[PDB]
Design a protein around this ligand. Structure first.
Ligand SMILES: CC(=O)N[C@@H]1[C@@H](O)[C@H](O)[C@@H](CO)S[C@@H]1OP(=O)(O)OP(=O)(O)OC[C@H]1O[C@@H](n2ccc(=O)[nH]c2=O)[C@H](O)[C@@H]1O
Lengths: 693, 14
C-alpha cells in the first residue's frame, strides 16, 4: 500500500528523468508489493506502449480496468494501444466504454472521432470532435483534427477565423515546447509561416530521436570510399510504398535503370508484399531487396542497413503512413536524403539533403528547409506513365468540326485497327468518319455494353475495364484491347469547354473555388469537372458554387476511377485547372500524360510549386501564372481562343514525349550524377552543402 | 474507387 505508492512515485520520477528501464523495474517492484495497484499497471502499460511493446502494455491495461471499473482513462489509453496494434474494432470498443463510464471525458470522444476519421467516416468524426470541444473548449488536438476533417469535405464555415485559430494554437504549442496538433504533412494547407512549418516537422523528427536514444546505440562507422563495394556507390531506397501506391506509380522503373557498373541498389521495404506487379517489379530489378517489415526492431533494421554498407540512404516517406524515420535517426549511412514521397521538409538534423529542383525550391527560400538543397536539373518529379500507360502515347477520334476530345480511341493495336477501316482521315491524329463502324461504338456506350468486336479487333467500353482485365485497370498490366473513352460516359457536354481537376477535394479552398467561378463566368460554354473525392464534399462545393452565382449544371462530378481509367479520361478535358494551395503532384503527371494543358499558380511552399516545376520541364512556361488575375486570364484565353488552345494542346501532346518529364532513363542518370556529387563531397571530408549547380 | 481501392499519400499516426 504505502510502500507501493512510494515505488510508483519513484518510477514516475525515474520516468521523467528519461531512465525508462529503471521506471519499468520500479513499477514491477510496486506490483510486487501491492499486486492490485491500478495506477501502477496503468503507468507501466503507458511506458511499455511508448517503448513499442504493445502486447505487454495490453496485459497491464487489462489489469488496470479490472481493479478499477471506473478507470475511464485506462480504457481510453488501452484503446490507443489497440489502434496502434491495428485492432480498430477493439479500439472503438475501449473508447466506447470510456465514454459510457464518463460521458464528459473529452479525450475519449476525440479518440473515437479519430477512428471514424481514419475509417473514412467524416461526418461521424466531425460529430465526435465537436462533442469533445463542447466538453473542453481548449483542446488543440480535437480542434486541429476537426479542421482537417472540414478541409477534407470542403466545409469552409468561418474559414478565416478557423485558420487564425489554427495558427494561434500552433504558435502556442511551439512556445510551450509541446507536439503541435497540426500534422506536418498537412501544414502546407494552413497560413502558417515557413518557420512554423519547419518547426512542426522538427518536433516530429525529435520524436524519432527520443525513440532511438533509449536503444543506447553508438554512432555507426561509415565507409570512407568505394573500395569494399568494387567502385560502386551503394544506394538504399527506403519506402513503405513498394506496391500499389502512388510512389511506385512514379518510380518503379528507377531501380532497374541504375547503372550496375557504378551503382548497387538496395531497396528496403517497410511494408509486406501486397501481391501486386509493382512489388514484383522492384523486387526483380533492384540489386538487393530487403523486407524490413519482418524486422520490427528499428535497432536491428538499422544494423542491417549498416551491414549492407549503404553510402546514401534515401527517405521516400517523410511523415507518411508506414514511415520508420527512427531508421534514419540512427544514421546507418553517411549521407541521408529525402526524395519524392514527402512534399516538404523533414525538419530533422539526421536528414542531410532534400532532392528537389530550382523551380520547386529556389535558393531564396532555402530557409524553409532544414536539409541542404540538392537540385535535379529539370524537375525532381517523375512518373512511370511511359511504361504503365503506353497505350495513351497515341490516340484516334471518331467524328460524329473535328474535336480531339469528344470520342477517343487508344490501344497498342490501334494502328492495325485503323488500317482495317476505309475513309480514315489524318489531320498526326487519325479521324474515323461517322459511318456504320462509328454508330456501333456509340451504341455500345449507350447500352452500357462491356465490349464489341469490329473487324476482329477487341473494342472495350472505357467504363468497364475492371470487368475485362482488373490488372489493366489498376495499372499493373498494359491493356491488350482497344478502349473507347467519350464525354457521354461522364455526362460532359459535347459542345463546351471542359476544365478539370482530379485531385482530392481537400486541396481546394475558398480563394481557389472563387477563381474557378470567375473563369466559368467568363467562358459561357464551359463546365468544371471534379471528383467525388470524397462524395460528401460534393454538396459543399455545389453550395459555395451556387453562392458564387454558378448554377448546378456548371460543375460536373464523377466517381473516383481505377488508375488507368483516371489517366485515360483526362483526354476528355480541354484544360486542367491546378490547385494553388497544394498542387496536383502525381495527379499533375497524370493529367499531362493525357496531353491536357494545366494552368498553375506557384506559391512558396514546395507543395504549391510542383506543378509549375513539371510545366517548366515540359516546356510550357505560358501556363504558369504569377498571380490570380493571370491564372484567370490564361484559363479564359485557353477556353475562348480555340486556335491557341489547339496550339497549346499540341505542344503538351508532343512535349510529354520529347521533354525530359516522363523520361525515366534520363531521370535515373541525372539522379546518379547528383548521387556522385553528394558522395565526392563527403569523401573529400566536407559536411553537406547545397548542390545547386 | 467505389468497388476497389485508390491508395493516396497518407499522414502517419501521431
Ligand atoms: C500533397 C501530397 O500528398 N503529394 C504527394 C506527392 O508528394 C508524392 O510524391 C506522390 C507519391 O507518393 S503521392 C501525392 O501526390 P498527389 O498528386 O497529392 O496524389 P494523392 O496522394 O492525392 O493520390 C491520388 C492518387 O489517386 C490516383 N487517382 C486519382 C483519381 C482517380 O479517379 N483515380 C486514381 O487512381 C492518382 O493517380 C494518384 O495515384
Amino acid at each position: 500500500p504505502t510502500h507501493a505508492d512510494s515505488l510508483n512515485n519513484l518510477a514516475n520520477i525515474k520516468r521523467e528523468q528519461g531512465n525508462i528501464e529503471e521506471a519499468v523495474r520500479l513499477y514491477r517492484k510496486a506490483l510486487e508489493v501491492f499486486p492490485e495497484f491500478a495506477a501502477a499497471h496503468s503507468n507501466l502499460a503507458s511506458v511499455l506502449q511508448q517503448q513499442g511493446k504493445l502486447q505487454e502494455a495490453l496485459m497491464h491495461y487489462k489489469e488496470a480496468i479490472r481493479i478499477s471499473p471506473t478507470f475511464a482513462d485506462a480504457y481510453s489509453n488501452m484503446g490507443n494501444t489497440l489502434k496502434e496494434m491495428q485492432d480498430v474494432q477493439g479500439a472503438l470498443q475501449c473508447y466506447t466504454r470510456a465514454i459510457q463510464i464518463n460521458p464528459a471525458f473529452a479525450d475519449a470522444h476525440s479518440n473515437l472521432a479519430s477512428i471514424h476519421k481514419d475509417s473514412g467516416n467524416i461526418p461521424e468524426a466531425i460529430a465526435s470532435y465537436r462533442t469533445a470541444l463542447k466538453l473542453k473548449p481548449d483542446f488543440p488536438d480535437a480542434y486541429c483534427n476537426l479542421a482537417h476533417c472540414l478541409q477534407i469535405v470542403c466545409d469552409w464555415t468561418d474559414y478565416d477565423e478557423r485558420m487564425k485559430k489554427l495558427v494561434s494554437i500552433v504558435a502556442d504549442q511551439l512556445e510551450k515546447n509541446r507536439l503541435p496538433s497540426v500534422h506536418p504533412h498537412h501544414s502546407m494547407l494552413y497560413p502558417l509561416s515557413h518557420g512554423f512549418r519547419k518547426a512542426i516537422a522538427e518536433r516530429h523528427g525529435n520524436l524519432c530521436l527520443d525513440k532511438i536514444n533509449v536503444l543506447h546505440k553508438p554512432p555507426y562507422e561509415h565507409p570512407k570510399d568505394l573500395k569494399l563495394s568494387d567502385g560502386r556507390l551503394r544506394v538504399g531506397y527506403v519506402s513503405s510504398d513498394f506496391g500499389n501506391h502512388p510512389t511506385s506509380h512514379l518510380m518503379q522503373s528507377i531501380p532497374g535503370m541504375h547503372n550496375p557498373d557504378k551503382f548497387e541498389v538496395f531497396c528496403y521495404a517497410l511494408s509486406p508484399d501486397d501481391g501486386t506487379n509493382f512489388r514484383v517489379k522492384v523486387m526483380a530489378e533492384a540489386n538487393h531487396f530487403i523486407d524490413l517489415s519482418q524486422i520490427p526492431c528499428n535497432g536491428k533494421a538499422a544494423d542491417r542497413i549498416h551491414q549492407d554498407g549503404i553510402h546514401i540512404l534515401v527517405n521516400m516517406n517523410g511523415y507518411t503512413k508506414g514511415a520508420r524515420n527512427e531508421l534514419f535517426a540512427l544514421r546507418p549511412a553517411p549521407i541521408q536524403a529525402m526524395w519524392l514521397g514527402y512534399p516538404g521538409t523533414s525538419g530533422a538534423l539526421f536528414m542531410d539533403y532534400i532532392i528537389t529542383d530550382q523551380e520547386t525550391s529556389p535558393a531564396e527560400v532555402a530557409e524553409q528547409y532544414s536539409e541542404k538543397l540538392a537540385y535535379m536539373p529539370h524537375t525532381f518529379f517523375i512518373g512511370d506513365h511511359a511504361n504503365m500507360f503506353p497505350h495513351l502515347k497515341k490516340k484516334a477520334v471518331i467524328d460524329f468540326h473535328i474535336y480531339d476530345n469528344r470520342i477517343v480511341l487508344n490501344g497498342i493495336d490501334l494502328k492495325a485497327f485503323l488500317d482495317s477501316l476505309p475513309d480514315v482521315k489524318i489531320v498526326n491524329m487519325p479521324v474515323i468518319p461517322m459511318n456504320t463502324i462509328a454508330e456501333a461504338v456509340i451504341e455500345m456506350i449507350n447500352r452500357g455494353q462491356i465490349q464489341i468486336t469490329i473487324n476482329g479487333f477487341s473494342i472495350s467500353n472505357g467504363l468497364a475495364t475492371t470487368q475485362i482485365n482488373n490488372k489493366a485497370a489498376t495499372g499493373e498490366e498494359v491493356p491488350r484491347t482497344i478502349i473507347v473513352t467519350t464525354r457521354s460516359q461522364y455526362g460532359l457536354p459535347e459542345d463546351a469547354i471542359v476544365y478539370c481537376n482530379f485531385n482530392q477535394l481537400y486541396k481546394i479552398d475558398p480563394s481557389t473555388l472563387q477563381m474557378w467561378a470567375n473563369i466559368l463566368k467568363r467562358v459561357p460554354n464551359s463546365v468544371l469537372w471534379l471528383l467525388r473525392f470524397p462524395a460528401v464534399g460534393e454538396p459543399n462545393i455545389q453550395q459555395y458554387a451556387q453562392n458564387m452565382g454558378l448554377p448546378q449544371n456548371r460543375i460536373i462530378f464523377s466517381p473516383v476511377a481505377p488508375k488507368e481509367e483516371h489517366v485515360r479520361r483526362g483526354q476528355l478535358a480541354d484544360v486542367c485547372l491546378d490547385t494553388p494551395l497544394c498542387n496536383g503532384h502525381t495527379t499533375g503527371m497524370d493529367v499531362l500524360w493525357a496531353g491536357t494543358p494545366m494552368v498553375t499558380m506557384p506559391g512558396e511552399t514546395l507543395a504549391s510549386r510542383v506543378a509549375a516545376s513539371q510545366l517548366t520541364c515540359l516546356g510550357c512556361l505560358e501556363l504558369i501564372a504569377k498571380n490570380r488575375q493571370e491564372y484567370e486570364d490564361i484559363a479564359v484565353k485557353l477556353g475562348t481562343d480555340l486556335e491557341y488552345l489547339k496550339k497549346v494542346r499540341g505542344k503538351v501532346w508532343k512535349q510529354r514525349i520529347s521533354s525530359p518529364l516522363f523520361n525515366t532513363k534520363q531521370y535515373t542518370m541525372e539522379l546518379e550524377r547528383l548521387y556522385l556529387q553528394m558522395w565526392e563531397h563527403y569523401a573529400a571530408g566536407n559536411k553537406p552543402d547545397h548542390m545547386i549547380k | 474507387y467505389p468497388g476497389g481501392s485508390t491508395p493516396v499519400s497518407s499522414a502517419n499516426m501521431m
